[PDB]
Amino acid sequence: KTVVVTTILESPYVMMKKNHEMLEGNERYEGYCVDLAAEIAKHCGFKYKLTIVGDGKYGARDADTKIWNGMVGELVYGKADIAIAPLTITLVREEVIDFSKPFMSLGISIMIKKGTPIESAEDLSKQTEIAYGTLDSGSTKEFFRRSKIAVFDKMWTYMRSAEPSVFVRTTAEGVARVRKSKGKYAYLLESTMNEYIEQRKPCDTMKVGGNLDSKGYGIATPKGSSLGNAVNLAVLKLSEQGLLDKLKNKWWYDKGEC
């Protein structure tokens, strides 16, 4: 049985090859998570098919219908065997799906346009001239919605009722907004994506401050799935052999344009 892999188009984890339409199957895609999937499958001894999640979301539970969307939804409702993506390990997700040990570490961070008068979250919360927001339907938004820490609680109170909305549908949208807002918009996003963008032309954004928190991306499988064990062991093995470090360098830094 070919394993169905749900993933998401997010640079540099999964990207369309410049010549996608003249290629087929897995060959259309490239990136950190494409390289990671290849190995995981090799070490676990399975065949797979990469598929981009339909709604383009990571995964959240609708408060009304209680239905899970995104990659999480694909696993919960039996559409996918495994998720290989920058999917954050969280308590609410861990209750409905299984995660491997983290294959990459990260934290919520601040992306600003270079020269923006902001050095930290506390700085953001103490002012109003500079707008700020997060990705919609992600772990970053939930972190702010749920936090009991004063600075973050305050930031959430502003963001949830700010208008027009400070939330974006895609990371790309968030970055575009920072770049076009002449320093009047700051974007809250995971450090890994912040670091990648920082190394790309036009080289006009920058990560400021330390991270607001600390967590990991995990490879996800449906609850109680037989894949979980092998996949978890493969991540540990690839970690120890230095593969993850190698892949980070290849897709983030070896490529640097700034």
Q: Give the total of residues touching its own copies (CB under 8 A).
A: 45
Per CB under 8 A, the segment of 10-18, 73-81, 193-201, 210-218 that binds its own copies is 210-218
Rounded to whole angstroms, how far apart are CA atoms 89 and 97? 10
Q: Read off the tokens for 96.
A: 């409905």
- Residue number, 116 or 134, with CB nearest to ligand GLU: 134
In the list Zn ion, its own copies, ligand HCZ, none, the entry touching 254 (Cβ below 5 to 8 angstroms by class) is none
Report cis status (omega within 30 of 0) of the bond before 164. yes
Q: Are 190 and 175 in contact (CB under 8 A)?
A: no
55 binds its own copies per the rule CB under 8 A: no
Torsion of CA 230, 233, 238, 239, to 10 degrees: 150
102 binds ligand HCZ per the rule CB under 6 A: yes
Q: Which of 30, 35, 39, 123 binds Zn ion (CB under 5 A)?
A: 39
Residues 207-236 within binding reach of ligand HCZ (CB under 6 A): 214-216, 218, 235-236
Please report the DSSP string for 135-181 in residue order.
BTTSHHHHHHHH--SHHHHHHHHHHHH-SS---BSSHHHHHHHHHHT
Minimum distance from residue 183 beta carbon to Zn ion (Å): 22
240 binds Zn ion per the rule CB under 5 A: no
249 binds its own copies per the rule CB under 8 A: no
**Positive or negative torsion for Cα 8, 10, 13, 18:** positive
145 is in an annotated binding site: no
Residue 166's DSSP bridge partners are none
Residues 103-122 within binding reach of ligand HCZ (CB under 6 A): 103-105
Q: Which of 32, 48, 58, 185 binds ligand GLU (CB under 6 A)?
A: 58
Neighbours of 77 (CB within 10 A): 11
* Integer angstrom CA distances of residue 32 from 7, 10, 12, 45, 194: 12, 10, 6, 20, 15
Q: What is the DSSP letter of 10?
A: B
Minimum distance from residue 232 beta carbon to ligand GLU (Å): 18
The residues that touch its own copies, with contacts defined as CB under 8 A, are 35, 38-39, 42, 89-91, 94-95, 99, 101-102, 105, 128, 143, 146-150, 158, 161-165, 213-216, 218, 232-233, 236-247
Chain residues that interact with Zn ion, rule: CB under 5 A: 17, 39, 163, 165
